[PDB]
Each structure stands twice: as C-alpha cells, then as structure tokens.
C-alpha cells in the first residue's frame, strides 16, 4: 500500500508551461508501474503519460509533443512537464501507482493519489 | 368368374388353428407353399415365421397372407388364391423380409399366385395379437420414432446398453462433477460482484464471464436431478429416445438443454482465446499504466457471443440434436458421430492452436521482462510475475491436455460406433430369431472413456475458477462479513 501526493497544480494562461510532480510516500516506487491522468469535472478518467523501465513512454494524442514525462528514481517522484497548455487541458490531474499486472488479473490493485486542478485561461 | 381358384387335392385339416385364430373350414393344400410339401412342414414353417410376432405394422399384415398361403381354403379340388391387394399389403411394413433374407418366389406378389381382386375367407378371421416388441424396444405410433425397418417400435428411452445401476452410478458422477464446477464459478462470479467497481477492467474481468459461461453450462447439467426432469428431455411422448430435434411432434425441453449447454460451453471456450489474446497484448506494454485494450472492449463482446449462436443455429438448422439417457443431456453428433467433428473437434482445435499460441507468446514475453531487467524491481513484483508463468504454464498444460483427452475420446466414438450400432442391430434379430421358434450385445461404449471425457469438461471449468484462489479474495470477502 503507498499513498500518493501530487503538487504543482494552479491556474495559468494559456500558452504557458507547468510542471506536475507526483511524490509516494513508500520506498516501494520502482515494483509499481505509474502514470499521469486527468479527469475533468463533467467528463471520465483521461489517459494523459506514462514511464516505462527505460526510455518507453506513452502519450496521448492530444498530449503527445507538448507533455513531458520522467521520473526520479531516487527520489520516489514522477514528473509531468506540461507546455504550450491549452484551455481545454483544464481537468484535476491524478497519478497513479499500480502493480505490473493490475490489468490481467483482479488480485492486484492500483493506488490513486488526490490529484490538483490545473486550470489554464483563454 | 374365378380367376381366384386353383386345381388341387384337398387334403385335411390336421391344423384347426393357424397363427392363433381359429378356421371357418376344414381342408387345406401345399400348393400355394412351395418351400414345404406336408402340412407338418408348412406348419413348422410357420413357426419360422412367427418370429414376426415383433414390429407390429408388419405382423398385422403378413398374418392374413401367411394363414392364406400355408394353409389356404380347399373345397371341390379347388383352392382359393390370395388377392393381389392382400399381397401388396406386406412390402411396405414388411420391407424387413427383403433385406434379412429375402422373399421367397411363392410370396412375391405375381399374378399367378396373387391376382387382382379375390376374396380370402382369411379376412373373416379375428387375429387378436396385435404384435409385441422385445425388451430393447417399445410400442409407438408416429413413424418419426420407428427403429430401421421395424415398423411399429423404437429404442426405449432409458439406453438399452447400460443397466439401471450403471445409470444410477454415471448420474451420481455428474452429480458431483456439477456441483463441484457449479459453486467453484459461482465463487468467481461473487467475487466479481462483490468488488465490481474495481474487477470491472477487461484484461481480468474476462475470467468473469468465462465462469459465468461453464455455470451457465453447469445449469443445464444439473437440471436432469430435478423430479422427472431428465425423462422431459432425452425422452418423447411415446417413450422412445430424442434424435434429430428440433421435430414438430415432441416439446422443447430437449432443445432447450442443448442451447444452454453448447452455446454456454463454446461461448467461454472462444473468451479463453480472447483472453489469451488480452494477455498477449497487455504483456507487451507491461511496465507501464498504458491500456492497450482502449477500444476493443465491445469487439471482444461481438464477437465471442456471436461465433457461438451461428454454430447453435446451424445445428438447429441441420436438426441433429439428439438425447442421451447416461448424460442426461441433450447435445449434437450423438445419433451421427460425423457432425460432433465440425461442432465440437473443429472450434476446439482451432481454440487450441490460437489460444495456445497467444498463450506461449504471452509467457516468452513474461520470461524476457526478467532477462531484459535483473534488479530493477524486485520482492513482490518479481514474485507476481514468476507466480504468473507458473499459473499460466499450468494451465496451458491442463488445457493442452484435455484437448487431447476430448480427440482421444471423440476419436474412439469415431472408430467404434458404428460396430456398436451393428451390435444393437444383431441382437434385436437374435432376439426373435432364438425365443419365438440368450442373447447378448457384442460391444457397447465404454463408461470409463465418457467420464474421462466429462473429466475434461468440467476439469476445465474448475480451472478457471482457480484464478481467483489468492489471498487477495479472502481479503475481499472478509471485508463483506464485517459489514454485516
Ligand atoms: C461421447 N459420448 C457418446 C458415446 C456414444 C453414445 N451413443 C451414441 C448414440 C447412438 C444412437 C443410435 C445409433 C444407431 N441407431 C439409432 C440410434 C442414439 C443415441 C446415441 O447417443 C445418445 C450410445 O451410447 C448408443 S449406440 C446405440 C446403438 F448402436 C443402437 C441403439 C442405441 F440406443 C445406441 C446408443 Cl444410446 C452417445 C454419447
Ligand atoms: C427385425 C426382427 C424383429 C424380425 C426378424 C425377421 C425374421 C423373423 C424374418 C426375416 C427373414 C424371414 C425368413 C424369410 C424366409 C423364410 C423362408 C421360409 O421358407 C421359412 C421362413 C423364413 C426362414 C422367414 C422366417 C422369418 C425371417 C427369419
Ligand atoms: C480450455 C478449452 C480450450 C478446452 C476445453 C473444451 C472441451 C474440453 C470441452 C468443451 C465442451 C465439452 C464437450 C461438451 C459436451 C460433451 C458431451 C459429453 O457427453 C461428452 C464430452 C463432451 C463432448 C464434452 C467434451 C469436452 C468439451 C468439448
Ligand atoms: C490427437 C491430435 C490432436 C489434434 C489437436 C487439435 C488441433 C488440430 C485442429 C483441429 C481442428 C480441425 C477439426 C478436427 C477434425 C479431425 C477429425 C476428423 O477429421 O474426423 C473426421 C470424421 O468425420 C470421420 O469420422
Ligand atoms: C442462450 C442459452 C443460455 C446461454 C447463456 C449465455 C451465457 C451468459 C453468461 C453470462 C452473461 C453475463 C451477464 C452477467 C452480467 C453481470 C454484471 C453485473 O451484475 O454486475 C453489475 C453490478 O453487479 C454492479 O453494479
Ligand atoms: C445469451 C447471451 C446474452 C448475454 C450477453 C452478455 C452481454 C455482456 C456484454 C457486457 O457486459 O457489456 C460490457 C460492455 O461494457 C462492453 O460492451
Ligand atoms: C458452419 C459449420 C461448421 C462445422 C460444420 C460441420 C459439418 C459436419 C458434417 C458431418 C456430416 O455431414 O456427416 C453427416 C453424416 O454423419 C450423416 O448425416
Ligand atoms: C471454423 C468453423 C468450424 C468448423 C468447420 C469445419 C471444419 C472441420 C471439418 C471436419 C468435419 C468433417 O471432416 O466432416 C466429416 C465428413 O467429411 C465425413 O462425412
Ligand atoms: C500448447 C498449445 C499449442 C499451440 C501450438 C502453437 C504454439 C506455438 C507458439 C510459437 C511461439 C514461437 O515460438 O514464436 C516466437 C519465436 O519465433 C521466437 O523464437
Ligand atoms: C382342433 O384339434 C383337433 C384337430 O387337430 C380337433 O378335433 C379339435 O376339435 C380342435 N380343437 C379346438 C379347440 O378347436
Ligand atoms: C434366424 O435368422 C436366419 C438368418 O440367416 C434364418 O435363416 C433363420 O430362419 C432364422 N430363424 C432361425 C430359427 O434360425
Ligand atoms: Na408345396
């Protein structure tokens, strides 16, 4: 079990960059594969990025080119490096912390963090 | 006019009784009998004959043309001839004759021996044996029930090869095989339920609705242990076997069965292949929080209950729905082996090659995760992945293995079924060929081989109720009893 805290989020312009941090409060960070979401108020559970063991990462297609993802392992955080926002960004970005086989089988669980609104004006 | 009146010497009745009826005259003659030349042997002829007494819609008819033609009526050195009519009477119902042995010259209907028109003082004659059947068969009336020509009887429901205790034994088998599959997916299907806001993602929640298909399919196993329930659905009104369903004459019960039974077990059969497929691809991007299954949730649907309802429908369309007594089910390729090739052996194999290739796909990629990265992440996450290999490598080997058990056991039916339907035929002849002027049937199915095969059938369903034995369950139903 590991409790997640996400920190960075606030209203910006549109245009402007942001960076979204994800900190865990555990040592367990690496067994656990983790991601970026976003979840507006009036919508579903968005995919945004993710970090694989090396150099993987995925985006979304709305996403892919101005988001950045990396993580620190030694520091137990995984970034999002957002850029160029636009307005319809605007959603609570959450992180995620699940097993690596959370999907396939329905023992494993996944850790959800409290997520922070990220805002952006036109 | 007498064209119906041959010269002879009548001679006297030493018989005043022919095939149990009383004679309203008193001389008789051998002419019309070629194969005997005294009335003792036209008599012991009879005798021969009267192993007729079977298949009622044959012994009706031929005993007016016997006691007409062994012994005829003879009055003035004249015998009357039976009519042609009488005569054409037998081929239909009595078309057994022909293919036993064949008729002989003196009753084939010529018009020498059987013009057209005569009147027979046999038709006067009262002949109250009705005709009856051997323990293997039973009376009917609609010709859909009928043994080949035995015009008038068909198989009896209970099967004829296997003993009341030999049922009861096969019953208590299945029994116990339902019950046990039963309550094991029914423990998936709760624990799916219980925690279905977080089961609810489709690279595991598909375990949920391959246990929900062998319950289902358990369901239609089990329904025969009700109160005359299993009599409702592998017998007919008259009391004969279920074959070629659907019909028009008999109800849905057998039908009914059948649908739930193939289309429940074909539908979890293809959704192992969907999730061998799941697995495959969610292993390529494991490491990361990316759901390869995106959009192709309601394609899986699509197309694991629809492969299943073309199958069922065509076998409905081909009418090869049959009853067995044993089982207690009604299922295809019983009667006709040849389509229980194409129904069962050809989705099952070809869920084999698909599904097993996904399968050894899926781990070889599990096995490069802890060659490609020693050390990366280790404790749990390691354990989970070798425990995952096992668990999948057991259970390509169980599945891998009754598939060939089912080859085996279908191949076997394949080899000797139709020595066994030779075996059913001879000893419904020896039958009335040795009482009336023991028996024993020479090879039938093997018990044995029908529960391996149903080993393989419900092995399977409890296999896939061993996904959820982990302590991550027990987790999740203690959670339920404290909130009570
Ligand atoms: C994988 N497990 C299968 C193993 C074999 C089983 N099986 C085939 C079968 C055959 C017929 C049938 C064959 C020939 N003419 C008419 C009917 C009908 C139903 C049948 O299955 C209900 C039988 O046990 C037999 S053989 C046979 C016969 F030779 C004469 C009269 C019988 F009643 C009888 C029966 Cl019953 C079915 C399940
Ligand atoms: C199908 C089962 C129930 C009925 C079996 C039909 C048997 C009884 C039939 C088929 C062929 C018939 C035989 C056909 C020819 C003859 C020759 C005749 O000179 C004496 C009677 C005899 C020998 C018949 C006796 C009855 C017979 C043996
Ligand atoms: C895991 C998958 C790939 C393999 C398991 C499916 C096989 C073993 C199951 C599916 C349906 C089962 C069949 C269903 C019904 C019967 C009728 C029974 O009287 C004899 C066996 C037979 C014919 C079963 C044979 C085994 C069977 C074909
Ligand atoms: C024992 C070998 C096991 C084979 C593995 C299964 C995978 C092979 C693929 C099978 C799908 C094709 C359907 C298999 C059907 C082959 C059996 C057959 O031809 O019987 C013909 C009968 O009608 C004659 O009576
Ligand atoms: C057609 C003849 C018989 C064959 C039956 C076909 C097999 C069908 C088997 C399973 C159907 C799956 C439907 C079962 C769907 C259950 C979903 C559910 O109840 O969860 C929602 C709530 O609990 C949470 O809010
Ligand atoms: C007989 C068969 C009837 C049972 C069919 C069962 C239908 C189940 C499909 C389902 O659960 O939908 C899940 C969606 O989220 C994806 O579309
Ligand atoms: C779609 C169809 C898929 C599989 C089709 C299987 C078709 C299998 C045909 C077997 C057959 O014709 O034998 C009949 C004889 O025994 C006498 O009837
Ligand atoms: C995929 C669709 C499923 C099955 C398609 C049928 C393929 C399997 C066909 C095997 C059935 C067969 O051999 O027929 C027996 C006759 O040849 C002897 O009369
Ligand atoms: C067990 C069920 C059997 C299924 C037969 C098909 C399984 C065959 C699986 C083949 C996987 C494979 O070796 O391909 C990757 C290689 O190119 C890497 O060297
Ligand atoms: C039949 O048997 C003899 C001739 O075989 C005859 O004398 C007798 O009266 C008859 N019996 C009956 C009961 O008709
Ligand atoms: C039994 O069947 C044979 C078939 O070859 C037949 O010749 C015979 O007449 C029948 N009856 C007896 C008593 O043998
Ligand atoms: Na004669």
């Known amino acids: ?122 | 006019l007498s064209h119906c009146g041959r010269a002879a010497h009548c001679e006297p009745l030493r018989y005043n009784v022919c095939l149990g009826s009383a004679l309203p005259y008193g001389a008789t003659t051998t002419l019309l009998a070629g194969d005997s030349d005294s009335q003792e042997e036209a008599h012991g002829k009879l005798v021969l004959w009267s192993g007729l007494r079977n298949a009622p819609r044959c012994w009706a008819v031929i005993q007016p043309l016997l006691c007409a033609v062994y012994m005829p009526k003879c009055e003035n050195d004249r015998v009357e001839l039976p009519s042609r009519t009488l005569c054409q009477a037998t081929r239909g119902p009595c078309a057994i004759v022909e293919r036993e042995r064949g008729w002989p010259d003196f009753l084939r209907c010529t018009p020498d021996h059987f013009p057209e028109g005569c009147p027979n003082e046999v038709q006067n004659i009262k002949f109250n044996s009705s005709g009856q059947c051997e323990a293997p068969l039973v009376r009917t009336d609609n010709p859909k029930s009928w043994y080949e020509d035995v015009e008038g009887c068909g198989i009896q429901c209970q099967n004829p090869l296997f003993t009341e205790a030999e049922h009861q034994d096969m019953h208590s088998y299945i029994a116990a095989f339902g019950a046990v599959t039963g309550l094991c997916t029914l423990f998936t299907l709760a624990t799916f339920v219980a925690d279905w806001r977080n089961s609810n993602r489709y690279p595991a929640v598909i375990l949920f609705y391959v246990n929900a298909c062998f319950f289902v399919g358990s369901i239609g196993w089990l329904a025969q242990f009700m109160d005359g329930a299993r009599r409702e659905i592998v017998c007919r009104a008259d009391g004969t076997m279920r074959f070629g369903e659907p019909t028009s004459s008999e109800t849905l019960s057998c039908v009914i069965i059948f649908v739930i039974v193939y289309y429940a077990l074909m539908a979890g059969v293809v959704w192992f292949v969907v999730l061998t497929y799941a697995w495959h691809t969610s292993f390529k991007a494991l490491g990361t929080t990316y759901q390869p299954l995106s959009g192709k949730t309601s394609y899986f649907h699509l197309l694991t209950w629809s492969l299943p309802f073309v199958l069922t429908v065509a076998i409905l369309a081909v009418a090869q729905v049959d009853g067995d007594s044993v089982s207690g089910i009604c299922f295809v390729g019983y009667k006709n082996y040849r389509y229980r090739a194409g129904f069962v052996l050809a989705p099952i194999g070809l869920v084999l090659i698909v599904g097993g290739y996904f399968l050894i796909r899926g781990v070889m990629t599990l096995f490069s995760i802890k060659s490609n990265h020693p050390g990366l992440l280790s404790e749990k996450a390691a354990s989970k992945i070798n425990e995952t290999m096992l668990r999948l490598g057991i259970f390509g080997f169980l599945a891998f293995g009754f598939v060939l058990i089912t080859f085996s056991c279908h191949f076997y039916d394949f080899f000797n079924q139709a020595e066994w339907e030779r075996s059913f035929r001879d000893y419904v002849l020896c039958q009335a060929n040795v009482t009336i002027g023991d028996c024993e049937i020479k090879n039938r199915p093997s018990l044995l081989v029908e529960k391996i095969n149903l080993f393989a059938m419900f092995g399977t369903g409890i296999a896939m109720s061993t996904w959820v034995w982990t302590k991550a369950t027990l987790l999740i139903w203690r959670r339920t009893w404290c909130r009570l």
């Open chain 1, 1 to 122: 079990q590991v409790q997640l805290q996400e920190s960075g989020g606030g209203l910006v312009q549109a245009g402007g960059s942001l960076r979204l941090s994800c900190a865990a409060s555990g040592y367990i960070f690496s067994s656990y594969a983790m991601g970026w979401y976003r979840q507006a108020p009036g919508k579903e559970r968005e995919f945004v990025a993710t970090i694989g063991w090396g150099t993987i990462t995925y985006y979304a297609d709305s996403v892919k080119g101005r988001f950045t993802i990396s993580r620190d392992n030694a520091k137990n955080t995984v970034y999002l490096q957002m850029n160029s926002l636009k307005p319809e960004d605007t959603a609570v970005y959450y992180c995620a912390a699940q097993d690596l086989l959370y999907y396939s089988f329905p023992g494993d669980h996944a850790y959800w963090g409290q997520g922070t609104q990220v805002t952006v004006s036109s």
